[PDB]
Every structure is written in structure tokens, then in C-alpha cells.
């Protein structure tokens, strides 16, 4: 079309995540700081949610994966492992089309499954519960590792898989998503029962081969992961090249919309042609990935959208956590105007971030929505990710109780009051002391709430002997006049005092000011949204 119609109620695949491989044996481990850059979200981090690791044929090297894998699990990431060869007493040589090749010996299948089981439990004993393990990396491009034919894989999936306990089983990790090596698994119910995820690589894979009708036909309840690629090349010092790097986002678009893949996993995380360079910083290829990985979190679903609404423009869209996300790619040489139409879901405003030849996730002005529709300018050779709060929704639990603390001493505006550090036990760099008996004040101007509603505002403060009353203002309106602050009993005894006030979903202000009687020493403020159904008395 021309309009990019985003059908929010027409659900597609459940997104599992985005990531890459750590390979200590071949390129060395990530350093501590690169782990954060890789698997944290928020500022200047890739937001990766999936970590792939090596299953070494030598079990005396298994220890090497633990440090990064633990950390990644602490950052909420999934972990899965891939073998290249079985142990070398399990392998025999043979001639395959003129070349000496390796395969798993036919009487050693049960033992190879025991070697995989042992990896899973070795990691479990060191605090890493694998989401999945794979039968073999690229069994159909194994010139340098161990080959399995479609029937060899099939035999193992029927007879030996699902004696794999402690995790999910993944197969066949074909190099080019070749259907011939997964078809046998899908067409056998007993082999199919033992497969939990169909993994595929996509090296050389044509757009038209991303579809897999048989998987649609017979694959309900199985996951579909794209477990290794790098694109469009492994050229030296290429990670920052533009517009070349834009092919990363196009490929991911293709994976998401043409292949309905739930996970997209890169080859080496840290590499000169990868998403993180050798200096530890995010490359232009890294940011292309970031456009999906940072905003399309695990648990989001893809939703139908006009995929190609103008010759060089590509659109995909996702829904989760009461948000719609849209990824729009203009591959062409001229900037384009693109209208987006939201259907079966609604928003008023839209945030957007854009990567191009001169910018990396640059924040653009909040543009807004009139009757489900909004237009936006997509620069030449750019990828733009849009984000918008959808109407009428919620999912809660505890829940917030997210708890957000704002210190009284920094990020604040003082009138006749000063920061001090005499009495200990304060959070932050100190506390604030009021100087005057009447109208010294502290004003927070940066209180940022997800939603409108009633907020509980807990003051942490110290007060030796008196009661000391404060007037309180929210957004310029006085909500309480001469609110008492009872003694804590000492300038070092920090107490708490909660009030209820109403605040918008944007940036708010809170102002406390003396009225006579001075004030207490003020440590910080904690602002929590009060749940619907809880306003108790
Ligand atoms: Ca004081
Ligand atoms: Ca403080």
C-alpha cells in the first residue's frame, strides 16, 4: 500500500529475543564491561536478551562459559548451547564426495546424548539453567566439524533426543535453513515430540526460502529460532560502514516478517565486523540490531503490518507491555514521507529514535496521532523505531512498588537550605538542612511517572525533638498545609512519613516549604504508584 496499516489485534509470533555468541575458546571471553554493554538495556547498551555458548568436545574446558553465562542470566537473558563436534573417541572418518569427513559413530549415539546431558548438568551445578541445547551446529555444512545426514539426525531425534533432560532440545541448525534436513523431523510425530525448538542459520538464504509451510502445518507449540548469521559480510574494519550496515536491519526485518522467527542470534558479539567492536563500543551494525533488541523485549508479539508500503520502505510492528513498537526502514537514497495507521488499538502520541549515516538512536520530537493516524519523515538510508503507549490496558501484580527514589540534595532546587553530611545513615551524597523558620524550601522538578493517578510519597527525614510543620505543593497546587513532621528522636535517627497525592504521567513538581517551626532534615523521597483497588482506611 502507501499507508502502513498496523493491525494490533492480529497477532503473529511470540518474540523470545535478540543476541549473539560468546566464544572464549576461539576469540576469548567478554570482559566484565562488555557483558553489561551486551546484555543490559538502557543507555549505550545493546539490550541483548539471548546468549549463545559453545559445548566443547573437551569437558575439561566447560568451566570457560560460566562467568558470562551467569551474568547474562542475572540480566534476564536466555542461554542456549551448541556443539560442533562430539568427543573424539565417538567420531570416525569417512570419504564424503572426495573429502575426508567426520561423523558420529552409529554405536555412540547414546553416549553423545550423555555428553550433552552432562553439559546441561555441569552448567546447572554452576548456576546456569540452559533454555535449550542443540544437536549439532551446521550438520549440513560440516567440512570442518561433524556431518549428519537428514536420516542420521532423524535417528538421533527419535531414539536419543528426549533422553535429554534438564532443558529443551534444538535441531537441526542447518547453515542455510535447508528444509530437507528438518522435514524428516516434522514428518515423524515421535521425532517431532522430542524437538522443542527448530533452529536454523540463514547464510546465503534467499528471502523466498524464509517461509516454511510444513512448519506452519505441523509445528504448533514448537519455537522457531534463527540461531546464527552475520550480514552482509565479514570484511575487516567494516562494522561502522554506511549504508552497508543498514542491511542488518533489513535482514532482521526479513527474519521477523518473512520467516516469522521468534529469535535472531548473531555470530560473535565482539568482533570488527560485529555489533560490538574490539574497543567495546557499539558499531553501526550494533545499532541496527539495537532498533529491535532494545524496544522489542521478550514476551512481545509481532503484529500484522503492511510490510512494504513504498518501493524502498519496510515495516514491522510488535505489541507488548501496553506498547506498540514499529520498525521502519528506508533503504533508498531519498527521504520519504510515511503515514502509519493504527487499527484495533489506539494511541495519542508517538516517540521515535533514528539511526543513519550521522546519528545513532537519536531521539526525535514527540509527534502525535489524529484518529489512529500519524505521518513521519524517514531519512535516506535510515532505520527508525517508533514507540507508543496504547489505550485502555494494564497488566499488574505486586506491582509498582517499582519504587523510585529521588535524593533531596541533588537533582533539586533549594531556597535557603543547604546540603550536609554530619549525621550518618542518609542515602545519596547527603541530606538537606532547612535554614529559616519560615519558607525555606526544597523543590523536585524531575519526578517522572509512568501513569497518572494517586502516588504515595514517602519522606525519609530526621528530627531530634520538635514537631515541625511543612506546607506541601504538587505541580504548583498546595495539597497540604502545615503537614506535621513528628520527631524521630535524634538527628541521626531516620524516620519515614507517607502522604497520598495525585500526579500526572509526565514530569511533575513537588515543593515542600517551611511555615514557621522550620523543617526536619530531609534525606530523600520515594514515589510509588498506588494500585487500583488499594486506597485503604
Ligand atoms: Ca534545619
Ligand atoms: Ca540523601
mmCIF file of C-alpha atoms in Angstrom, residues 13-18 49-50 78-80 130-133 157 167-173 177 182 185-186 192-200 212 215-216 218-227 259-265 298-299:
data_model
loop_
_atom_site.group_PDB
_atom_site.id
_atom_site.type_symbol
_atom_site.label_atom_id
_atom_site.label_comp_id
_atom_site.label_asym_id
_atom_site.label_seq_id
_atom_site.Cartn_x
_atom_site.Cartn_y
_atom_site.Cartn_z
ATOM 1 C CA UNK A 13 4.894 -14.790 16.627
ATOM 2 C CA UNK A 14 5.848 -14.584 20.277
ATOM 3 C CA UNK A 15 9.250 -12.878 20.421
ATOM 4 C CA UNK A 16 11.838 -14.707 22.526
ATOM 5 C CA UNK A 17 14.798 -12.364 21.978
ATOM 6 C CA UNK A 18 17.852 -10.988 20.204
ATOM 7 C CA UNK A 49 18.183 -10.987 25.659
ATOM 8 C CA UNK A 50 19.730 -14.221 24.245
ATOM 9 C CA UNK A 78 18.045 -16.744 27.993
ATOM 10 C CA UNK A 79 21.050 -19.039 27.355
ATOM 11 C CA UNK A 80 21.432 -21.903 24.852
ATOM 12 C CA UNK A 130 20.065 -23.664 29.854
ATOM 13 C CA UNK A 131 16.915 -22.699 27.994
ATOM 14 C CA UNK A 132 17.993 -25.132 25.226
ATOM 15 C CA UNK A 133 20.774 -27.291 23.806
ATOM 16 C CA UNK A 157 15.829 -37.280 17.360
ATOM 17 C CA UNK A 167 16.426 -28.386 29.109
ATOM 18 C CA UNK A 168 14.816 -28.040 25.662
ATOM 19 C CA UNK A 169 16.215 -29.748 22.539
ATOM 20 C CA UNK A 170 17.066 -27.740 19.412
ATOM 21 C CA UNK A 171 17.614 -29.019 15.836
ATOM 22 C CA UNK A 172 18.962 -29.088 13.176
ATOM 23 C CA UNK A 173 20.771 -25.726 12.876
ATOM 24 C CA UNK A 177 17.659 -23.088 6.590
ATOM 25 C CA UNK A 182 14.248 -30.571 9.154
ATOM 26 C CA UNK A 185 11.748 -34.437 11.972
ATOM 27 C CA UNK A 186 8.477 -32.624 11.257
ATOM 28 C CA UNK A 192 8.765 -34.242 16.466
ATOM 29 C CA UNK A 193 7.699 -34.928 20.066
ATOM 30 C CA UNK A 194 11.354 -34.747 21.199
ATOM 31 C CA UNK A 195 12.156 -31.441 19.402
ATOM 32 C CA UNK A 196 11.354 -28.264 21.352
ATOM 33 C CA UNK A 197 12.872 -25.622 19.032
ATOM 34 C CA UNK A 198 13.574 -25.660 15.314
ATOM 35 C CA UNK A 199 16.868 -23.775 14.978
ATOM 36 C CA UNK A 200 18.172 -22.542 11.612
ATOM 37 C CA UNK A 212 8.300 -22.784 5.902
ATOM 38 C CA UNK A 215 6.443 -25.831 9.987
ATOM 39 C CA UNK A 216 3.201 -23.821 9.876
ATOM 40 C CA UNK A 218 2.869 -29.297 11.812
ATOM 41 C CA UNK A 219 4.834 -27.101 14.257
ATOM 42 C CA UNK A 220 2.315 -25.870 16.852
ATOM 43 C CA UNK A 221 3.941 -25.436 20.289
ATOM 44 C CA UNK A 222 7.485 -25.596 18.859
ATOM 45 C CA UNK A 223 9.637 -22.472 18.860
ATOM 46 C CA UNK A 224 11.460 -21.172 15.787
ATOM 47 C CA UNK A 225 14.845 -19.515 16.311
ATOM 48 C CA UNK A 226 17.341 -18.040 13.878
ATOM 49 C CA UNK A 227 20.444 -19.073 15.826
ATOM 50 C CA UNK A 259 10.305 -16.139 8.332
ATOM 51 C CA UNK A 260 8.185 -15.426 11.455
ATOM 52 C CA UNK A 261 11.315 -16.096 13.545
ATOM 53 C CA UNK A 262 10.928 -15.679 17.295
ATOM 54 C CA UNK A 263 14.644 -15.208 17.983
ATOM 55 C CA UNK A 264 17.510 -13.657 15.966
ATOM 56 C CA UNK A 265 21.021 -14.581 17.148
ATOM 57 C CA UNK A 298 10.919 -10.946 25.285
ATOM 58 C CA UNK A 299 7.163 -11.622 25.583
#
